[PDB]
Amino acid sequence: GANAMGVLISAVGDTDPFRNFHDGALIHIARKYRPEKVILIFSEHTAKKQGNIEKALFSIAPNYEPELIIHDPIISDNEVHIFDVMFQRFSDILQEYYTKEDEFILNLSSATPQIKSALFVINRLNGINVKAVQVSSPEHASNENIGHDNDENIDELIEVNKDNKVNFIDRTIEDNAEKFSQALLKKTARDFIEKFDYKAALDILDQLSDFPNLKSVREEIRDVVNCLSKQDVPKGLRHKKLKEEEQKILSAYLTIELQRERGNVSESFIRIKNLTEFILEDYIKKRYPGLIDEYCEDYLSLFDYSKLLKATKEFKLKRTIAPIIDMNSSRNKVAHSLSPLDSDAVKQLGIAMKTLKTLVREQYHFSQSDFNFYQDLNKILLTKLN
Amino acid sequence: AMGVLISAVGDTDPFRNFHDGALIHIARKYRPEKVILIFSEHTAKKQGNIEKALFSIAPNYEPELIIHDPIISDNEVHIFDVMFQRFSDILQEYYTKEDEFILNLSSATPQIKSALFVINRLNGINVKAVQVSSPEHASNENIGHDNDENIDELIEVNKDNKVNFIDRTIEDNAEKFSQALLKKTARDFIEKFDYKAALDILDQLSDFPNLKSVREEIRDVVNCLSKQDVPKGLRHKKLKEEEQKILSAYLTIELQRERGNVSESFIRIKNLTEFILEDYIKKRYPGLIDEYCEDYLSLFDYSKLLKATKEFKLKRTIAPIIDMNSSRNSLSPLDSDAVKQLGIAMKTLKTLVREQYHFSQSDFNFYQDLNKILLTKLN
RNA sequence: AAAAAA
């Protein structure tokens, strides 16, 4: 299609078009950047000045003929000062006019603070990141004790205006929102962490400008990410109170809970069988040395362990794993098939879950606190990320 | 547990136009036990008048006044990003969970008032934030500043100096801005394929036109994927049922690699490869598998069936995946030699299905393309 | 309602 035009989106305030022998923000940005289109957002208070605005814009240079879009509806005066209302209004306005194709400029220095705030914020909250320009006061200080030129003769203001030259003094400052963009990225990293997407959180942290806590937070998350992918035990779960296999059991269990939270239900069924199998092997090797080797004159399965628990009169434990044995058919669908699970097969996972937990709680005496590893880690990580 | 007002100081404070400025008006209404004052160079000049005004509210009301150090340079007080960082730091310095804070959204430069409005929600503290409306209830154009006047005169003629003053405060609850931050979080989740986390946000959003559409789209994905089913969007009418199962299960493996969950993918790759081979043999050699089943079939069986049919190119192609059987088989950790195996099986598998089923570049891009539509609807 | 309640 056609090539990009420069479009200046701007509101209008008491300092437009001119004040104190100088350009207001709107005219100054137009004068410097010469946009082809200018979308003008008025309020009831400022609409009376529409003609003087267009006169001022066509007064800049003789071959400068900007296309002036006068937005509709204008902004009601009893809304123009409310923060949250103007945020919505200028979200709506910016979605109405933004195009990927053109090259936009936001005037951050005309109208109420609630409108200027909204423009500054939305530019980055919605990731359009167009050019955002402030215009300094010519006082380079408070405009206290400096009046408004709105009741004056427009043609005079145009003539006396000190910016009415080719070599005007540039009072424009471009915003790049470096610090604010970091806060938005950190917010995303925190959102990811709360929901246990540690890999996605780590991707954000690798692209962050440095600050004190950044390297330890990144180091803590990397170890979690790396170990979990390799199906290892993160350093944080290698409690010295626990034997090595207890650490593997505790971590493998907590990973299925993470898996459940993230909606990976079908993958849970293979993990529950493997963990239960590992726990039973561990229990039988510890309690009946040489039993498994005798049996193995034939990898053992839940069914083999069930027989061994009968042979050893381990009758409570035999009933404990019965719900996990029931979901054997569904585990088979996720392990040797592409057939889908029904909603009943799903609800099993909740039952096996409550069972798995009472199992590991009973055999290894994990505390409520031990089960809370990732929640408690998140707490500390989040505070370290502002 | 005490009430604490954080406030900058502007040209309208302490008094203007026979009325409270924002700082005094908020203090007069809410009576914070503590008031943290952030001056700039320009406004520090009237510190004494500010304190006199604050103590002039009531004889039995003495707020504890904290004069923040360092004051803000006038040459930064007007820049958006700088003032955002500055007041982000200030709020972290003073915030406690035990107290109850108030933010004055109506004193100092627009960049300072914007910073206060934004950080309150961006950073989740969500304390009370108050605007004070001009007594003109309109533009203060043509209204001067009373900073050069007599402070005692101002205090006495102040129309607000009374028990039943006109309440000009407006409490900000940032309903729309809070929704935008939730939408941004939902967008961020979608780009990274956490459809479940995105769904949980969308279930908490105030309704807007597209919401129900976007909700249903994601719910179908989350629900079908959790049951190892095929999302409706992947049931392409151009595809045989089992080709849809194959395309979906492949893309699910890709999703797990993106989310870092490599551990899962080895069992997924085996079943998908087993399913492809059985598809290929059932089509090409009718009854062969039944003949073979005279004494669930595994990769080893399909390998022998490929041998028996002299399909040696195919038997060779699936060799990386059979090699992976040691790693796919407990609770020991994968080493990095096995992590690279998965990467190769993934390329092997992709080329297999491209040959066997002729999936297009676009077909493999289902989730990326769906995210595009979802994201636009969530702006 | 440009660097200071609309």
Residue numbers in the entry:
A (entry chain A): -3 to 294, 299 to 386
B (entry chain B): 0 to 294, 299 to 332, 337 to 386
Paper lines:
Csm6 ribonucleases bind cOA using a CARF (CRISPR-associated Rossmann Fold) domain, resulting in activation of a fused HEPN (Higher Eukaryotes and Prokaryotes Nucleotide binding) ribonuclease domain. Here we characterised the cyclic hexa-adenylate (cA6) activated Csm6’ ribonuclease from the industrially important bacterium Streptococcus thermophilus. StCsm6’ is symmetrical dimer, with each monomer displaying a CARF domain (residues 1–173), a central 6H domain (residues 174–239), and a HEPN domain (residues 240–386). In the dimer, each domain interacts with the equivalent domain in the other monomer, but they cross over each other at the 6H domains to give an ‘X’ arrangement.
We proceeded to solve the structure of StCsm6’ bound to its cA6 activator using X-ray crystallography with data to 1.96 Å resolution. The Fobs-Fcalc map revealed electron density consistent with a molecule of cA6 bound to the StCsm6’ dimer, which was fitted into the model. Upon refinement, it became clear there was actually a mix of species in the binding site, which corresponded to intact cA6 and the two products of cA6 cleavage, linear tri-adenylate molecules containing 2′,3′-cyclic phosphates (A3 > P), with occupancies estimated as 0.50 (cA6) and 0.50 (both A3 > P). Given the symmetrical nature of the StCsm6’ interactions with cA6, cleavage takes place at the identical (but opposite) sides of the cA6 ring to produce two A3 > P molecules. Interestingly, the 2′-OH group of ribose and the phosphate involved in cleavage form minimal interactions with StCsm6’; the 2′-OH forms a hydrogen bond with the backbone amide of N10, and an oxygen atom in the phosphate with T11. Like EiCsm6 (24), the 2′-OH group of ribose and the phosphate involved in cleavage form only two interactions with StCsm6’, and neither of them are sufficiently reactive to play a role in catalysis. This is highly suggestive that StCsm6’ does not assist cleavage by deprotonation of the nucleophile or protonation of the leaving group, and instead it is purely the conformation adopted by cA6 in the binding site that drives catalysis, which would be consistent with a function in slow auto-deactivation of the enzyme. Whilst upon binding of cA6 the CARF and 6H domains appear to tighten with movement towards the dimer interface to enclose cA6, at the opposite side of the protein, in the HEPN domain, a number of the secondary structure elements swing outwards to open up the cavity. This is accompanied by a significant rotation of the CARF domains relative to the HEPN domains, of around 58°, making the overall effect akin to opening a pair of jaws upon binding of cA6 (Video Abstract). The displacement of the secondary structure elements in the HEPN domain causes an increase in distance of ∼6.5 Å at the opening to the active site. In turn, this movement brings the catalytic residues closer together in order to form a functional active site.
